[PDB]
């Protein structure tokens, strides 16, 4: 809805989009994430994490180390621009963020930090 | 909102959905396929092919063996319940099939037959 | 090695190999599975499963529906030609099966049935 | 990579190896990429491209917007430490890099930039 988008993480380990362009005019941007399917959080949990394309591997990696308990994300990870919780099947979480925290000319990526998921579960937040 | 789905196949080789539910009640079923992106058909084509889950492997094998001149589908392959055209980026196609050609208690699956694709571009279809 | 093969399923969802060649003169064939890395089975579980290339999807679809508790393998699944248990990191398992269960010019796929992994974890098995 | 390392990208979109060990003593490294299979560059093209785990994504995203006519590689990408060209089956390319261009305690990776192959096709490389 102009300054929001709905993302679904599934039992097949996929997002439903790999591109999001956030609009200039928008003051804050929300991400509504849902997890259709039947698998719990501990085998197939998906979060939505945003960062510059250069900080991605560092966040996935520190996330990988942090554990299920840390939502598979390093607490107060300064490279994490915005993010939801790690939810299992049928659950939902949303994150709304300040747009002036993004700048034009920079490539961002969203990705899930559950182990190995970023493999297939990521996009460019097409602002790049 | 009921007996037709809109799906899309992208440039990162993913369908926007990996699972279609067909309410038995609907009598004809329609699928509108669009190719978001910029990659031409010879590079990243997307079709939407439906067979039983048992015939999928073979549709694919033979689909490959049929080159682009045949849209990566074997001519009048009896295994194909329905299918669209292989569409390059920025185009679309639609296909309507009779839902009576589906029997409860059987795994159906949609996949793209463009070489290499079936691995990510696929999902279930089920009468419900 | 002699009519037995060494393979891994690591933490990045990968097999080292994507093709096993079996000899018509090997009476039985043994596949030794080890999972290097630090992830526990619930997150990065790996089994090595064998079936024909046509039964792969149903074998995968059904095994996912089986649950961790059943190792993501539909028990008594007559479509499986051989399999290990699903192991976490630093665990091991091996399977030895009679080579007469294979027929010349039939195609064998080996894959992992852990939710999400088979698109990444699969390869070819062929009788020489 | 390695005195030389011989790698294969096939039509199943796979590299016959997910890990390189470049001997700190060997002064220039060679990687020989070949392509078993019968698929053309336009459909199943392969390049081996090396960078840091860190830059992996921006090169990937930037390689994709460059086209195969460019071999899906952004020219003068300072980040690519070395790369082959994109090749079709029945081809072999090679590349030799200066090994002082890598350091110890720096995460490196290889991947092919053909659209949607980076998720499958990738492995770490590490100075021994
Ligand atoms: Cu996930
Ligand atoms: Cu396709
Ligand atoms: Cu696995
Ligand atoms: Cu490739």
């Amino acid at each position: 809805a102009e300054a929001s988008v709905d993302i679904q993480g599934n039992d097949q380990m996929q997002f439903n989009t790999n591109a999001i362009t956030v609009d200039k005019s928008a003051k804050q941007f929300t991400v509504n994430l849902s997890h259709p399917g039947n698998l719990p959080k501990n085998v197939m949990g998906h979060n939505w994490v945003l960062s510059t394309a250069a900080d991605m591997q560092g966040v996935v990696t520190d996330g990988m180390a942090s554990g299920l308990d840390k939502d598979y994300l390093k607490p107060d990870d300064s490279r994490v621009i915005a993010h939801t919780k790690l939810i299992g099947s049928g659950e939902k979480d949303s994150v709304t963020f300040d747009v002036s925290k993004l700048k034009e000319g920079e490539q961002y990526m969203f990705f899930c930090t559950f182990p190995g998921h970023s493999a297939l579960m990521k996009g460019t937040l097409t602002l790049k």
Side-chain angles (χ1 to χ4, degrees), chain A residues 8 11 17 23 27 30 38 42 57 69 72-73 78-79 81 88 99 101 107 118 124:
Chain A
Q8 294 178 353
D11 287 342
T17 192
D23 201 81
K27 269 70 133 138
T30 315
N38 317 301
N42 80 318
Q57 204 45 25
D69 202 29
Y72 268 130
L73 257 212
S78 170
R79 310 160 287 191
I81 299 160
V99 179
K101 207 170 273 180
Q107 303 184 135
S118 68
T124 55

Side-chain angles (χ1 to χ4, degrees), chain A residues 36-57:
Chain A
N38 317 301
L39 304 176
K41 211 171 96 83
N42 80 318
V43 169
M44 191 56 76
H46 308 325
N47 48 219
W48 185 89
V49 186
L50 180 65
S51 73
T52 48
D55 273 305
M56 181 178 196
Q57 204 45 25

Side-chain angles (χ1 to χ4, degrees), chain A residues 41-42 45 47 49 59-75 83-87 113-115:
Chain A
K41 211 171 96 83
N42 80 318
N47 48 219
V49 186
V59 166
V60 157
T61 265
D62 291 359
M64 220 266 226
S66 289
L68 184 70
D69 202 29
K70 298 313 170 53
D71 270 350
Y72 268 130
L73 257 212
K74 168 218 310 180
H83 84 101
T84 75
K85 258 188 190 192
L86 171 88
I87 55 141
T113 63
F114 192 101

